[PDB]
Amino acid sequence: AGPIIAGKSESSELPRVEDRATFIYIEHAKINRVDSAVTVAEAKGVVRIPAAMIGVLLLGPGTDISHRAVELLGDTGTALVWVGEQGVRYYASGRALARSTRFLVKQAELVTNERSRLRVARRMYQMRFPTEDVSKLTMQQLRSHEGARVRRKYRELSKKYNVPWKKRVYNPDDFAGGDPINQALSAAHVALYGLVHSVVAALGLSPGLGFVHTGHDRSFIYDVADLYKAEITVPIAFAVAAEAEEGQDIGQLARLRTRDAFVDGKILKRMVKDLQTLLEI
Amino acid sequence: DRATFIYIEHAKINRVDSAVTVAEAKGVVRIPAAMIGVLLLGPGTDISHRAVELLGDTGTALVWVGEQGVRYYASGRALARSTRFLVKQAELVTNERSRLRVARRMYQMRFPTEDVSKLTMQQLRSHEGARVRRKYRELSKKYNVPWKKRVYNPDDFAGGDPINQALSAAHVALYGLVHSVVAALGLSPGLGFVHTGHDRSFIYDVADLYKAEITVPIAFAVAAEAEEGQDIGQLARLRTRDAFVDGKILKRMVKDLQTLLEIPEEGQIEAEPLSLWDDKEKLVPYGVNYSE
Amino acid sequence: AGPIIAGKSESSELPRVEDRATFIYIEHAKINRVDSAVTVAEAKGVVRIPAAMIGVLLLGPGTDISHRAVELLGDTGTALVWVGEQGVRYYASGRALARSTRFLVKQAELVTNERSRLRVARRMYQMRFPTEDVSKLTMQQLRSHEGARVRRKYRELSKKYNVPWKKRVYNPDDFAGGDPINQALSAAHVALYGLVHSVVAALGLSPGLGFVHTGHDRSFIYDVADLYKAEITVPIAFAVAAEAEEGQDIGQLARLRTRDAFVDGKILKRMVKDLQTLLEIPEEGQIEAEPLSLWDDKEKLVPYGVNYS
Amino acid sequence: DRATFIYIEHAKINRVDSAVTVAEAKGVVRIPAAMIGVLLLGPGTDISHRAVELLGDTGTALVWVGEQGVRYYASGRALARSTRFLVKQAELVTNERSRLRVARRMYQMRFPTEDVSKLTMQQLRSHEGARVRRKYRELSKKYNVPWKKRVYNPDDFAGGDPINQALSAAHVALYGLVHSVVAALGLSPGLGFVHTGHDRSFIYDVADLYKAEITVPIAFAVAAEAEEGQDIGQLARLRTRDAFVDGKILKRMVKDLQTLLEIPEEGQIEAEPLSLWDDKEKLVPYGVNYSE
Amino acid sequence: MPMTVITLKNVPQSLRGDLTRWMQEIATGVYVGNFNSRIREYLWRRVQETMGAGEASMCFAARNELGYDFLTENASRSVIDYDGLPLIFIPKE
Amino acid sequence: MPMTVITLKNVPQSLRGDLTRWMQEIATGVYVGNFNSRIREYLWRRVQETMGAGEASMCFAARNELGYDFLTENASRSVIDYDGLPLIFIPK
DNA sequence: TAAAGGAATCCATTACT
DNA sequence: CGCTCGTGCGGGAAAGACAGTAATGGATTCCTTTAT
DNA sequence: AAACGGAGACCTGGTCTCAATCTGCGTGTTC
DNA sequence: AGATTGAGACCAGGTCTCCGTTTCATGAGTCTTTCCCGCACGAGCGGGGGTG
């Protein structure tokens, strides 16, 4: 092929969306491109991030990121999520890792047709809960059932792990993250949202073309994330809250446990295959 | 119905109470975030976590670009995190009737005189190719630069005519700014009408509107005055950069994107660029404080 | 354990007998020890040999080795075989890798008893030729039949690959030749004999306590090598002799194809298992608390290192 | 039937026409190949491929040893490639009657002042332990060296009493010579009669013959003649190698190995521990050339 | 995925930092990663085209007795196959 | 068997040669080898005891989504754990 | 006047794009 | 019940369509010297 | 404002070489 | 004679600071269709306990 420029790479030179790590959390540091490498600088020293092997690169409070740093992070398909306190605050992504827009046009075709939208909503709800049958449920009924089931799962896991819980269903837009249960849920949930955003942006899908969630630019991200949220993140967050000690970093423990859950459950390959079968390919 | 497109480069944005603090060498600017619509973080810009927090709170659409948008590097959300433009684009591109209507509108704004109601999609493509050849020949005879066929080698840019290099560089700069505007507005670059099957199909479908009138004249001009031994890609990028510094091209692109999707004129939003150190007189009434 | 010293390693720190590489051929170079490392110095540079990862080392013509190099190689279980012209010339090895002698005791018991020796030779013949039945013939009949089938295989493969064979057979004792076929057979068999010697030495078995072959210190080496020379080395050497063009190193290609055959046929794990099953050693994963013990008539083993006042 | 245990150290052995050559600093030696029975290659020895081939052709056994055989490092084949010693050892160790016979023989040659042919294994080992204790006390009182009880850690050599360190070093220096002789003669070190279950069992069985007569007195002499802080293991090894220089112990060991295996006197080969420059006048009539 | 190691000596700082997007740098000039065959081959091609006048050596899992094989591009230490087995050869000055 | 890499800087010459006895020297102080967990731990103990006043760093195939993990003895480049992911941290 | 012939005129066929 | 080799389904890349012009030979037309 | 390349500056660590000293790594009748 | 160690030497490469020059390595006037390669899939032996 053509000449290779340091800091520029083709999509065939990169690991697939499935073969890369999940995420890295960075806080109280400075992302900076030096020697064509994304380096996070802290007080003690610097660490050079393997961007090509990481899906999403979460950014914590007190994080300053350069311009060429974002350029290089978008080059390798790594998505950026400004994970502050009480939820995800901003998203950012490069162009894409897939040069074929077949999945995007298929998603547009399925989202612009009302019958297809209802069919995809039923498929997603069935995929969340395979024991039920919803072949005759309407869109509002589907949304209400999803809310009821997620609240039921929250309360069930609250009683299971013997922890106080305020039934506050996690909404990343202005969440209430005061409690240790709230902090653990947010710590797992921002990682899941970042992973979903990275996968969607890497596969070429439009984050705005949602089926259940709609009305904003990240609707499809929220749909795909809610598909696995109750089944992955909530048990992990409740276990972290239940299994905790005084003076222990709740956020770090929650992120460790949720990364372990992502690896054990293969949520990345599962996410890609679920997008495959959810869009009729 | 107002959308500010601020291009910040050579600066470091932070936040104090509720307003971003641009820290350029010229001085410190204290733009309130409530009136910022699109923030084009150009080269040499350092954004901070508090700044991103405040901007995402107000629905700002940060876009990491090159010089005045010559290259598109990354983007955040859209204006007010709205997806009405994306929804309209999808609904117009999925069905062949609306897709053909939009392609015809594309052709008719590119060529107001020619009728489009009888041309099919491939007829539109063929006619566009013919007019492109005509424009190439006309500008070649106007600027002296001779014109053998466009021979773009995707993997080898060094091997080619200086005019071919100029066309390639000007066109990629145009693609960059078109992509920046599309990402800021919230449309998907994939869902293209005339162009289909690629990641940036809509980007080409918006760049061909301005190719013959902006980037092709620029490329022919830079090739005509190109002295031997000088790289043409940098010259074309810089000339397109200046043409974008003028700032009307971004307004035209936002207007044309709103026109393609038959957005009602009552609900259409108007985009205007804002330079901090060139438009401070209008910014002072808006509450934009300056310090030198 | 004890303090770690460069040049001395425990048996556990080294790979098992079957997990190592097969062999290395070295010629026209000097093996020495520098920086506690076995280094082969050629006319142009040095090559540090991962001796812990290599089962046996072959020494070609014009090769020098130093005393410290030899003891260093013997530390890691690597055996030295002086594979000159006309076949294997000399062997060398250090202490056995296996501290226990549970294999050597059984080998001695079988080789001393005439009935057990007959049974073991019969089992060897069965492994070489599984189709036939060997419940009746005697030792001399076994030797005559194995020789007949060996030259039968030689003639068969010589006709198959169209190579001229002068009604000969390969035996490492005084086998001389200059033809490409003889050189290919020698190169293919020296590797097998070296690997067999390394496996036997690393298992603690006595190379001299052979069953079919008798009268020399490397009889058991020959017997264990016979189980695979017909299957592996002979067809490989014939193929090398047929394939090679003019002006080509017949030895180099022979050894390359020999290593390919050893990797493909899994000769090393198979060899360990064959040695374990010939001696009728039951599988026993438990490890003894102490290898050495004093022998008693009535109490069998009695612990060592104690003063009986 | 005589075996020449020629010892080579600080030399570089090659081959001239059909006889190995020695390249010691003193001069050049041209020993005929057939002359050498066993070549004990000491430290600083460079053996060549031609030399190894020639020595293997004549049945010579090459044993890479330490200084005067204190450590056994590697061994080639048996002397004259013979195996009758190994087969006899296997026959005598396999069956219980011969095992009792040889164990009683070893104990009896270890007990010159008593007849122990009637004692069983328990009584024999009790008597051996009592004799060991008596010899320890005798050599402790002779050299005025304190002695309480033999205590050592195989995994911690330094953390031991100087007496125990000296005894361990001398006994290991004996094991090296015993292993060298066993390997040169063709026996198997694993097949021991009294000691069983180890690679080096027969070596310990043979070395117990000379433990109380060589290594224990040497160890106690070293312990008595030693200042605090001196490396006593090196001193014990050096004294033991000084004991082996004369070669009387080598001949005694060969003869004892023959006696243990019930070898007929006609079949008993005799070791000839030759030294290169010590026995020039003895070796010149035999065809050995001594150049300087 | 098979483990890949690349050692770089005297190469432009652009490549030295660029490889860190794929492989972490355990020590100066030494990078370790886990890729499939295609990604590793593209990484080696990139190293070849970017190192300029420098020394680069890669070791990756293979199907020989040792289990690894080397590609050296303008490196001081060559690789010699001893009858199908890779041994690193050090020329003497 | 997994893959192991050992980098040694400023260590005695004997340690370098001894590692060459186990694993080949691709680079100055950089060794690669194939063997299991037991031999790897024994080699790491050997390096730990016989490195003196030098730094050692071993990267071995492991069970994290990067696919490898690190053990450093008195090394300049520390290893920092970002929520289950080992990253090489260079102090300033 | 008209054959006649080639150059120029207009046209048709195809490769260029 | 965890390992391999032979069977293939998402990516490619390459031609191959789809549309009309530019130049040149042929048909046509005009001149223009041929011959007269 | 960033990030790079070039050009210096400088340093540590690797390697070669010269005397100088040793020949080497130590249980097996100890609990 | 071979190998190790300490000393002392040299020097190549690494790292830092400084400086001036950049904001960059530049396709799609058009695509579908027919080709492919993929790195997944694939199945049996296992090795059981059971068989003997």
Numbering used by the authors:
A (entry chain F): 2 to 282
B (entry chain E), D (entry chain B): 20 to 311
C (entry chain C): 2 to 310
E (entry chain D): 1 to 93
F (entry chain A): 1 to 92
Quote the study's own text:
CRISPR–Cas adaptive immune systems capture DNA fragments from invading mobile genetic elements and integrate them into the host genome to provide a template for RNA-guided immunity. Here we reconstitute CRISPR sequence capture, processing and integration by a naturally occurring Megasphaera NM10-related Cas2 and DEDDh fusion protein (Cas2/DEDDh) in complex with Cas1 (Cas1–Cas2/DEDDh). The natural Cas1–Cas2/exonuclease fusion (trimmer-integrase) catalyses coordinated DNA capture, trimming and integration. The Megasphaera Cas1–Cas2 retains the canonical heterohexameric architecture, with two Cas1 dimers (denoted Cas1 and Cas1′, a or b subunit) bridged by a central Cas2 dimer.
Aiming to visualize DEDDh trimming and conformational changes in Cas1, we used cryo-EM to characterize Cas1–Cas2/DEDDh in complex with a DNA half-site analogue containing phosphorothioate linkages at the PAM positions. Neither the initial 3.1 Å density nor any heterogeneous states detected during cryo-EM data processing had density corresponding to the DEDDh domain on the PAM side of the complex. The 3.1 Å half-site structure reveals interactions at the first integration strand junction. The spacer-ligated first CRISPR repeat guanine G29 was found in two approximately equivalent conformations. In the first conformation, G29 forms a canonical base pair with C35 (Fig. 3d (middle)). In the second conformation, G29 flips upwards, making a specific contact with loop 7 lysine Lys168. The lysine also contacts the 3′ hydroxyl of the leader (Fig. 3d (left)). Gln141, which sits at the base of helix 7, also makes a nucleobase-specific contact with C35, the first bottom repeat nucleotide. The 3.1 Å half-site complex reconstruction contains density corresponding only to the leader-proximal region of the CRISPR repeat.
